[PDB]
Amino acid sequence: VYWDLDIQTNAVIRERAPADHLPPHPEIELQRAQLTTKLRQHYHELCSQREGIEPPRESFNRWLLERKVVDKGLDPLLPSECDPVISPSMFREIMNDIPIRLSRIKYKEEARKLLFKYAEAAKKMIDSRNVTPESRKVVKWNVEDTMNWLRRDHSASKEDYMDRLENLRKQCGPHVASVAKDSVEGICSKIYHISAEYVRRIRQAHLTLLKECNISVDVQDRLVYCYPVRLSIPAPPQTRVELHFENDIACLRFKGEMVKVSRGHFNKLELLYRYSCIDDPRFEKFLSRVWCLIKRYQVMFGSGLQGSLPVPVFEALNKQFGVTFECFASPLNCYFKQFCSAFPDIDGFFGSRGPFLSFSPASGSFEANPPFCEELMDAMVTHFEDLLGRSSEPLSFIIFVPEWRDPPTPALTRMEASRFRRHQMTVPAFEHEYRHGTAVIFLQNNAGFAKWEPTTERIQELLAAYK
Ligand SMILES: C[n+]1cn([C@@H]2O[C@H](COP(=O)(O)OP(=O)(O)O)[C@@H](O)[C@H]2O)c2nc(N)[nH]c(=O)c21
Ligand SMILES: Nc1ncnc2c1ncn2[C@@H]1O[C@H](CSCC[C@H](N)C(=O)O)[C@@H](O)[C@H]1O
């Protein structure tokens, strides 16, 4: 019991026309996977060649999320038409690992080595690259001073080695960043432009496949309860996908390419499909779409960027606050059968109402636990407040985000200043679920505060769901 797919939605939206996404097909999903692998390899080579570092961990996945906040292009996963070209997310993260990535340390001798590795790398940067005479002398001085200190006979403690490195980095940081800035911007641009070329190839291959199937590629303000995203383009025929089970693992094979998912999740996807898909009454296309679904989420992750809430917390949210809907989810991790997700082209067959920024409820009770992408969280807040002020009908959002204070993130700062905030608290931090600290913000309008008020009792039952 990791989900409850019997709960009915209370989200109300304007009736919307079916979406224009090209319907998914394993041939196209496999090509997207192969090209995304190549794109990750291009990113690895650029970081190595231009800055002598590994790609910052999780930065490519966070780049996919930031780019989709502004992407206007045609791929459901890779970006291709973004303003601005340079991602502030990828830029931030690469710069933080220049001239080296600071790693975790346990031992006095590991802190000593890291302080030395940093000083050596900063020197090599100054010796080999274009730098102003002002920046050159500041770095060179700090580096020689650190080497003179390490040259002393009597040794210091682990915390002194760590403090020394912190201070050296505060001093050299700005100078090192000015030396690498144009180079790092060039990595951000180049990987964006390679992505755009891959998107164009995938798009042409997908259009050709529909033409081969003789499939052609070319509404009210009435309120309705929400429903899954529908595609206007007819889906292509099922392809041959084979299924067998192996120690409670579902194994789906398309043309020699295997994907795996647990039996429990497979059975859940079968139920979501029954509740959500309207074009496949004999399940002819079901295994083709499950194969696409698993492959797409494997490609997205590349096999630390998001948390999940315990089941009893979702139970409390539904019982105490009438929550029926997840603003950020996937068919694999959702608790409810209605949710928003990143990939409407494939997730709609399993209950997705599409990406959250494109979803406009006039009323309902919602939970939101976004991935750890600062730009997405900030757009999420802008969207919240736009919806809360466009509707007088009961509307509530209970939001879970990490308590980032050093520095604060704009989303959390803006939510705390919101005229819609009814309550805020701190709950246990996100832990790994088997299926810092967490800020919980209640944003409601007048009618939402009236219907689902955060009273003392209801707050206690929610807190009890962790205990
Ligand atoms: C700990 N932390 C993580 N982020 C975001 O997450 C990215 C990676 O942050 P990190 O500290 O390099 O990695 P970790 O969170 O996996 O330990 C940053 O570039 C920010 O976008 C953070 N963003 C802000 N504003 N404040 C924080 O304290 C903070
Ligand atoms: N634009 C978008 N709209 C909705 N969900 C998105 C999204 N971009 C990414 N996501 C999804 O947001 C989820 C965050 S993890 C949240 C897990 C669980 N549903 C919970 O609410 O606790 C991930 O599944 C991620 O893929």
Side-chain angles (χ1 to χ4, degrees), residues 229-247:
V229 171
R230 312 301 192 198
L231 307 182
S232 57
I233 300 174
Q238 58 270 17
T239 193
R240 181 83 174 173
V241 173
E242 293 172 354
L243 166 74
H244 76 289
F245 286 94
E246 192 172 296
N247 309 317

Side-chain angles (χ1 to χ4, degrees), residues 42-62:
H42 281 294
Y43 181 48
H44 190 275
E45 297 163 10
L46 287 160
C47 289
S48 182
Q49 289 170 336
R50 308 283 174 93
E51 300 300 335
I53 60 164
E54 310 252 83
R57 295 186 182 177
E58 214 68 49
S59 60
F60 185 98
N61 292 354
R62 223 177 328 248

Side-chain angles (χ1 to χ4, degrees), residues 65 297 306-309 314 326-330 333-334 340-342 354-356 367 369-371 376:
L65 293 166
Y297 276 95
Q306 63 201 31
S308 206
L309 297 179
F314 273 110
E326 284 151 281
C327 289
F328 299 89
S330 69
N333 69 36
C334 65
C340 285
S341 69
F356 177 63
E367 174 271 358
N369 179 16
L376 176 54

Side-chain angles (χ1 to χ4, degrees), residues 62 92-93 96 374 404-409 436:
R62 223 177 328 248
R92 260 206 315 278
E93 288 189 66
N96 192 46
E374 287 191 79
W404 285 338
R405 300 290 175 181
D406 184 78
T409 194
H436 257 98

Side-chain angles (χ1 to χ4, degrees), residues 18 82 150 152 186 208 223 239-240 273 340 419 445 461 465:
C82 293
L150 291 186
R152 294 185 195 187
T208 291
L223 300 170
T239 193
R240 181 83 174 173
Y273 197 85
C340 285
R419 64 195 197 274
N445 62 10
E461 293 298 335

